[PDB]
């Protein structure tokens, strides 16, 4: 510690028992001065151990200037009383400059009184009938005022520097949250919220507006009775604080909740014409004048591409008004429901491959400061029928997983390839959000082999947009995304609890299926998703009939047409094949009635065969 307060241990009980934090500041300096007096009262073994007895005296003199500013001594006592550490830095800087703001307020409050006593004593000297030595004492206290106001200007600049650093820290945090929300829209498991950013932005804004107020108060006082340079200095400080305030309010207006139809909460940024949707904008600066409401105006495609791009207008209204009472109750938030979209009756990209951007504008005003805040949502796709809901979702993912620039509506005119390191986890996120379980490494590697093949010697392969939505997947009559989406729908609607408890392998290759079912007892079966039929689950059990033979029976895949009137657990419960049940154990070694017993409720089919020769496989 640079400050000298040695051997705190002797009077440690005293200092530890003291009320330093209460004496940091308060309604009465009297408590701090009482701490001073009784501290001195306290300050009053071998002599070699009593050598510091002299050192004490030094301290007892060093704090003599603190008898003029007792809050300074009490403040010394009170202040002396890792992936994300940036949160702590933000909060600590905010607290620091709040304390500095209190000190600056005290400085202004006493400078006003000093100027008032200067005027009160200049009136008398001007009323003197002599108009000379006391005039120079008056000029001396005037020079003291000049030095004080220079100190005030330097303190304001020291505040501006730290506030600038705080804003330069705060804005990147908000952009990081924007990227995290972009990931969260496409079903990534992220828990977030603008509450913390609200507190940070609002602390910064409150202190900026407070400084803006103090500068005006200062200027009015400063003139006393533009001759002083305090006018120019206050004007410069005011220009600077206004620059910082505008720089903050620029990004303080964001879209808290992206537009999403209430019919489909799971999939945002897909909007059907005529169907209402729900957007939500928030102003992170929770500062609102209690006498005037704030209105947000909505527009669609402010800068439409100049190409066959369909035009779209808004039915009903394009405004949300927030009264100050509601703004206090719920924060400065505009939640747009009942927003409907309609095409204006009047290229190579499909209907689901064109992107639209919904923008919002506010005329914000607080403490005389006015500014127009503008922000727009993530790009959106507009469908004509719900039968596009699936494929249109493939347009959302591919953007929010790979678009660098979010203002790119020409994204699918030249779509980039999705690396597997990004696409795999997203395919996992889909299941994770929509249904209980995600995708583990085995099923993800199965999908990787299905998309790229076992030969791929390139780490993190790139999947083409055409190979993801348009090119068909070889084993079946469905492209990869449509097939996986129908699988997701099948799991959610008919296999949710089965998929949650891990009773379903799901994505295993035919070859891997045989490899796993070779070294198991007859009657062991898997539940895997059919790569040939659209949205179908198939069951495959192995049987050994000869020393060299291992037959793998499979069932014709069960789709929604069968599972709507007969659950899969009941089919496994009573397969009744010609007549003992061939499904004896679920892989690896769980009894068939045990792995599905909890799903059984109280109160034909077709098969296929693939024979694996034991020894020709053993080669």
């Amino acid at each position: 510690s640079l400050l000298p307060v040695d051997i705190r241990q002797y009077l440690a009980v005293w200092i530890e028992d003291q009320n330093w934090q209460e004496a940091a500041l308060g309604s009465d300096d009297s408590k701090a001065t009482m701490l001073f007096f009784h501290f001195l009262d306290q300050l009053n073994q071998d002599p070699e151990s009593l050598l510091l007895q002299h050192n004490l005296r030094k301290f007892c003199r060093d704090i003599q200037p603190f008898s003029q500013d007792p809050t300074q001594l009490a403040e010394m006592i009170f202040n002396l009383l890792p992936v994300e550490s940036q949160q702590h830095e933000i909060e600590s800087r905010i607290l620091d400059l709040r304390a500095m703001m209190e000190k600056l307020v005290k400085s202004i409050s006493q400078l006003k009184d000093q100027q008032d006593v200067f005027c009160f004593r200049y009136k008398i000297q001007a009323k003197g009938k002599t108009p000379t030595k006391e005039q120079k004492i008056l000029q001396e206290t005037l020079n003291e005022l000049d030095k004080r106001r220079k100190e005030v200007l330097d303190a304001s600049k020291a505040l501006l520097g730290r506030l600038t650093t705080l804003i330069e820290l705060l804005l990147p945090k908000l952009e990081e949250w924007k990227a995290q929300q972009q990931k969260a829209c496409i079903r990534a498991p992220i828990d977030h919220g603008l509450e913390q950013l609200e507190t940070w932005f609002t602390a910064g804004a409150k202190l900026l507006f407070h400084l803006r107020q103090l500068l005006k108060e200062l200027k009015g006082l400063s003139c006393l009775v533009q001759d002083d340079p305090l006018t120019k200095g206050v004007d410069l400080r005011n220009a600077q604080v206004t620059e910082l305030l505008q720089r903050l309010l620029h990004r303080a207006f964001v879209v808290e909740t992206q537009p999403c139809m209430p019919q489909t909460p799971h999939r945002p940024l897909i909007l059907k014409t005529g169907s209402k949707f729900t957007v939500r904008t928030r102003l992170l600066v929770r500062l609102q004048e209690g006498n005037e409401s704030l209105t947000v105006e909505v527009s669609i495609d402010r800068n439409p591409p100049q190409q066959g791009f369909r035009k779209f207008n808004i039915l009903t209204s394009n405004q949300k008004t927030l009264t100050p009472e509601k703004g206090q109750s719920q924060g400065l938030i505009w939640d747009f429901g009942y927003l409907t979209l309609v095409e204006q009756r009047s290229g190579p990209l499909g209907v689901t491959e064109e992107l639209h951007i919904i923008s919002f504008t506010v005329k914000y005003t607080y403490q005389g400061l006015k500014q127009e805040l503008k922000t727009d949502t993530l790009p959106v796709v507009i469908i004509s029928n719900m039968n596009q809901l699936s494929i249109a979702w493939a347009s959302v993912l591919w953007f929010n997983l790979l678009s660098p620039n979010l203002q790119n509506q020409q994204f699918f005119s030249n779509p980039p390839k999705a690396p597997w390191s990004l696409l795999g986890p997203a395919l996992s996120w889909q299941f994770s959000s929509y249904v209980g379980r995600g995708l583990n490494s085995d099923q993800l590697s199965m999908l990787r082999n299905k998309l790229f093949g076992q030969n791929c010697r390139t780490e993190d392969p790139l999947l083409s947009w055409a190979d993801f939505t348009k090119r068909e997947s070889p084993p079946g009559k469905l492209p990869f995304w449509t097939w996986l989406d129908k699988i997701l729908e099948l799991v959610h609607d008919h296999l949710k609890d089965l998929w949650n408890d891990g009773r379903i392998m799901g994505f295993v290759s035919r070859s891997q299926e045989r490899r796993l079912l070779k070294k198991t007892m007859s009657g062991t079966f898997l539940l895997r998703f059919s790569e040939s039929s659209e949205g179908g689950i198939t069951c495959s059990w192995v049987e050994h009939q000869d020393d060299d033979k291992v037959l793998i029976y499979s069932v014709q895949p069960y789709t929604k047409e069968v599972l709507q009137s007969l659950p899969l657990t009941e089919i496994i419960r009573h397969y009744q094949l010609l007549p003992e049940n061939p499904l004896r154990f679920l892989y690896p070694r769980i009894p068939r009635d045990e792995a599905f017993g909890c799903y059984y409720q109280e109160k034909y089919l077709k098969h296929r065969l693939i024979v694996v020769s034991n020894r020709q496989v053993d080669e």
Binding site: D29, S30, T33, M34, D41, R61, Q64, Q68, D113, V117
Partner: protein, 600 residues
């Protein structure tokens, strides 16, 4: 430097600190005599200790610099060295031969006149035991705790007798000055004072000047020693009655620093009126303490450590000598007489070089001298004269040749006299004549409010304990009640502080340092009884001794003059302070105990 006089002292204080003894070659002393140095602990502070009661009861004045900058005194070795370099390390050119001759004639005549009715005498120990108060700052290995303890101990008096025998044998081994500098903002002063025994030697040798009132107005005509601030205004008005020009109250810039070897030479002329043994003692004190002296002063050194230097000088005057005030008053009387003679054209410019007809100086002195004395009031370096005409304004040749240059005035510009005796400065005060409800007159001291409050805010640092602070605040409040009742804010603060401090207590001391602060406010007696005793009962200028009835009957001075002398009435913070005076006095009663009387 006459080493045969200071050598033993230098060597003794060298042997006291021989481990760190060294001879610095980078000392900033140009007019003094450097003899060595030694490391010493740092002392003092960059700012004085502030009283709690005053700061909490004078909330509005926290903003005006007039009561704050006065407490911003740094007694740290850096400030002490700066004050020494600026104020003390100066060299006065010797006056011309005729000037010194005139000085000798006037000084001899004045010493004879002050002794026409008085005879110098010894001063016993009992007198000194009385005068000592409840520093004893020793400079060598024999050290004490306080002066009242050392003065009652026999070993102290034996240690003093040893040095007395040394003075009788022509040697000197203990009388060493200790200088403490004090830097302001301005009026930064250096303080000299020897240890208790050397000052007692000074006392026994020369204190008859003080104890026998050799500088009193009765015996000196021009002096004012003994009179309090409650009578100097009467002195000034009675001076105003006499015919002549304006009244002049010029101040000498660093009076103590300007006293030459010839001033001390002409002050030592009083040795011709003392008995032979008294003469031995007093001549020893003069030549081993006044005309030859060694001082110890701190100076900052490298590494944060402070080093005390042992320095020596011959022709100057210290501050804490037992008889420094009397000799200062004497020399100032001689100065004013010489300037009067120059003004009346008795002394011309050619008498500066060599006084050709010295009788013209004696004749004047015998025909007019005493009269001029009656037309002047001299308290040490401070003085107010009323000459026979205004030629006194431009009688400057002998004043400047003696080195007594005037403060805040060009060297050869005529002085400015006051036509109104209620505006003339005397002892940092002016004096105003105000009337009671009986129509009777009262001349009363007054000064600016800012200094009166700032001097009340400081604490010596030896009264750090809260009890000391409270008792000293009561001292200041009752001093205001007795001397500055005519001020609105001071009356309010006095009635507030006396109500905040417990009534049964006794006040500490140190309200003022002027010899005119007699200290009648240090008693628990009813302050109105003290006021009546000082202003009506024992007042020789008050004929009708009819008493007053209460402080509500005490006259404030006029509002306009009050506002002019630093008042704050009518100010919004002042009015809010007066309104919340009850809140503040009750909050100040708290953190102490006890406020047994409400004076509001």
């Amino acid at each position: 430097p006459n080493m045969k006089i200071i050598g033993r002292r230098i060597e003794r204080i060298r042997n006291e600190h021989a481990e760190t003894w060294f001879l610095d070659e980078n000392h900033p002393y140009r007019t003094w005599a450097y003899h060595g140095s030694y490391e010493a602990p740092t002392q003092g502070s960059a700012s004085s200790l502030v009283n709690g009661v005053v700061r909490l009861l004078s909330k509005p004045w926290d903003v005006v610099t007039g009561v704050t900058g006065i407490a911003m005194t740094d007694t740290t070795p850096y400030g002490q060295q700066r004050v020494f370099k600026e104020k003390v390390d100066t060299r006065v050119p010797d006056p011309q031969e005729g000037t010194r001759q005139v000085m000798n004639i006037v000084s001899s005549w004045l010493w004879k006149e002050l002794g026409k009715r008085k005879r110098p005498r010894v001063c016993t120990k009992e007198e000194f035991i009385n005068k000592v108060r409840s520093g004893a700052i020793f400079e060598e290995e024999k050290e004490w705790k306080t002066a009242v303890e050392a003065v009652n101990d026999p070993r102290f008096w034996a240690l003093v007798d040893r040095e007395r025998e040394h003075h009788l044998r022509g040697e000197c081994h203990s009388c060493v000055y200790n200088m403490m500098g004090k830097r302001e903002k301005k009026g930064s002063r250096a303080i000299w004072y020897m240890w208790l025994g050397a000052r007692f030697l000074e006392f026994e040798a020369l204190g008859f000047l003080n104890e026998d009132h050799w500088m009193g107005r009765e015996n000196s005509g021009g002096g004012v020693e003994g009179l309090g601030l409650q009578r100097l205004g009467y002195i000034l008005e009675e001076m105003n009655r006499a015919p002549g020009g304006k009244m002049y109250a010029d101040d000498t810039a660093g009076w103590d620093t300007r006293i030459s070897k010839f001033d001390l030479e002409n002050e030592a002329l009083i040795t011709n009126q003392m008995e032979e043994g008294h003469r031995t003692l007093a001549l020893a004190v003069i030549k081993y303490t006044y005309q030859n002296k060694v001082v110890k002063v701190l100076r900052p050194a490298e590494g944060g450590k402070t080093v005390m230097d042992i320095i020596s000088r011959q022709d100057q005057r210290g501050s804490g000598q037992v008889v420094t005030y009397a000799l200062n008053t004497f020399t100032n009387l001689v100065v004013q007489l010489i300037r009067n003679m120059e003004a009346e054209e008795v002394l011309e410019m050619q008498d500066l070089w060599l006084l050709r007809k010295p009788e013209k100086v004696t004749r004047w002195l015998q025909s007019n001298g005493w009269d001029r004395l009656k037309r002047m009031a001299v308290s040490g370096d401070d003085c107010v004269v009323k000459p026979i005409d205004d030629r006194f304004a431009h009688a400057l040749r002998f004043l400047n040749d003696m080195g007594k240059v005037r403060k805040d005035t060009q060297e050869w510009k005529p002085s400015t006299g006051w036509s109104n005796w209620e505006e003339v400065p005397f002892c940092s005060h002016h004096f105003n004549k105000l009337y009671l409800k009986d129509g009777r007159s009262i001349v009363v001291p007054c000064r600016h409010q800012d200094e009166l409050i700032g001097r009340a805010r400081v604490s010596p640092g030896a009264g750090w304990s809260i009890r000391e602070t409270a008792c000293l605040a009561k001292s200041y409040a009752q001093m205001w009640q007795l001397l500055y009742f005519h001020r609105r804010d001071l009356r309010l603060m006095a009635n507030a502080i006396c109500s905040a401090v417990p009534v049964d207590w006794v006040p500490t001391g140190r309200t003022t340092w002027s010899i005119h602060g007699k200290g009648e406010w240090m008693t628990t007696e009813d302050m109105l009884m003290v006021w009546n005793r000082v202003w009506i009962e024992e007042n020789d200028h008050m004929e009708d001794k009819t008493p007053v009835t209460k402080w509500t009957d005490i006259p404030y001075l006029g509002k306009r003059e009050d506002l002019w002398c630093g008042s704050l009435i009518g100010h919004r913070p002042r009015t809010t302070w007066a309104e919340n005076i009850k809140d503040t006095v009750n909050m100040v009663r708290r953190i102490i105990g006890e406020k047994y009387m409400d004076y509001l």
